[PDB]
Design an enzyme around this catalytic site. Structure first.
Site: not given
Ligand code: 0KX
Ligand code: MG
Ligand code: NA
Ligand code: NA
Length: 318
Positions: A239, A170, A139, A182, A96, A62, A179-180
């Site tokens: 979370d 992170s 972010r 926790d 989804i 590729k 990104g989130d």
DNA sequence: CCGACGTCGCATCAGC
DNA sequence: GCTGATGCGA
DNA sequence: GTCGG
């Protein structure tokens, strides 16, 4: 340095996961894109690339095609394909996955607009995903993570001063964005041999937590937002995991990461006669039989057990 | 050649 | 109604 | 798709 190659491999990765439902092929392309992302030279041929762990025959081929023509016929083709590009796109909504995206596309539902006019075919998680589609793809700058952390550590102490809560990921490693969020929670009354709900309730009472994706006795997943006549903050993924005290620091180590740093550490501990999962560290007996979980009271304990010098969260990208 | 590739909590479905 | 499977996002 | 027993 090889942005064209790594974008191409990341795009192919997504189609594997989302359209072809070939999760192992998704991971293969991602591993390949990673190993190449870190390579410190502009690649000249697929054969140069194949020397890397994760780059095989078909990816070398590729790369050859890309380098000679600037594109890949198969990728150009799937990009132009209505069904497939819509399937791949819908999976950007949280809740989804590949299967719900396939069903929507099957019945003509292909765009966020279409999802917007078909609420009743969306489960609870997917409505929240659609509601915050754009927010969930941003972010979080460190500064907002610190304000978020302030709220969470404050409300958690206010519910019961003996909770221990740690924001991992992170952010715990000192990254400039996240990104989130926790949050790992423990309480001296909870070991292996209501606590979550009280915290979630209080964070909802102060309007920090704004929606719930899922909530059990041990794990919460949902959505939160900092308080605002300046423009409001984006909704963010949070979370909260409740972990028994005797497993707390293995949880913290793991949920702190990085990905790659986790892996080595696990390998180092093998080639030392220990096994580290997210819960426990255990000894391997003279023939591979795991013995009992070993007592752990801090991150450092785990590091000692395997004779590594305690490494700072900031020094843990590998 | 051919199987592994991470494992699991929660929401919801499928089968009874 | 109950139990196990599957989808999902970690 | 790649690796490796
Ligand atoms: N495949 C994975 C995913 C996550 N992890 C661990 C290490 C991660 O730092 C931690 C959290 O995952 P994460 O939130 O997706 N990544 P992380 O927080 O480090 O960075 P961002 O969320 O800021 O992008 O779980 C892992 O060991 N293997
Ligand atoms: Mg994170
Ligand atoms: Na999704
Ligand atoms: Na996605």
């Amino acid at each position: 340095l090889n942005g064209g190659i790594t974008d191409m491999l990341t795009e192919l990765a997504n189609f594997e996961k989302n359209v072809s439902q070939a999760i192992h092929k998704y991971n293969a392309y991602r591993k390949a894109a990673s190993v190449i992302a870190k390579y410190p030279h502009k690649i000249k041929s697929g054969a140069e690339a194949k020397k890397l762990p994760g780059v095989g025959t078909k990816i070398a081929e590729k790369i050859d095609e890309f380098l000679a023509t600037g594109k890949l016929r198969k990728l150009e083709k799937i990009r132009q394909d209505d069904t497939s590009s819509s399937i791949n796109f819908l999976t950007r909504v949280s809740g989804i996955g590949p299967s719900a995206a396939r069903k929507f596309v099957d019945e003509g539902i292909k765009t966020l607009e279409d999802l917007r006019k078909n609420e009743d075919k969306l489960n609870h998680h997917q409505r929240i995903g659609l509601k915050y589609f754009g927010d969930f793809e941003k972010r979080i700058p460190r500064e907002e993570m610190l304000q978020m952390q302030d709220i969470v550590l404050n409300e958690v102490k206010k519910v019961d001063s003996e909770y221990i809560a740690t924001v991992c990921g992170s952010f715990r490693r000192g990254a400039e964005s996240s990104g989130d969020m926790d949050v790992l929670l423990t309480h001296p009354s909870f070991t292996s041999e209501k606590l979550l709900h009280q915290v979630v309730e209080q964070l909802q009472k102060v309007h920090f937590i704004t929606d719930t994706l899922s909530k059990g006795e041990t794990k919460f997943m949902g959505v939160c937002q900092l308080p605002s006549d300046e423009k409001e903050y984006p909704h963010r993924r949070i979370d909260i995991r409740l972990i028994p005290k005797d497993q707390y620091y293995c949880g913290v180590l793991y949920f702190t990461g990085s990905d790659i740093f986790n892996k080595n550490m696990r390998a180092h501990a093998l080639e030392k006669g220990f096994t580290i999962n997210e819960y426990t560290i255990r000894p391997l007996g003279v023939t591979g039989v795991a013995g009992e979980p070993l007592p752990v009271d801090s991150e450092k304990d785990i590091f000692d057990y395997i004779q590594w010098k305690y490494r700072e969260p900031k020094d843990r990208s590998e």
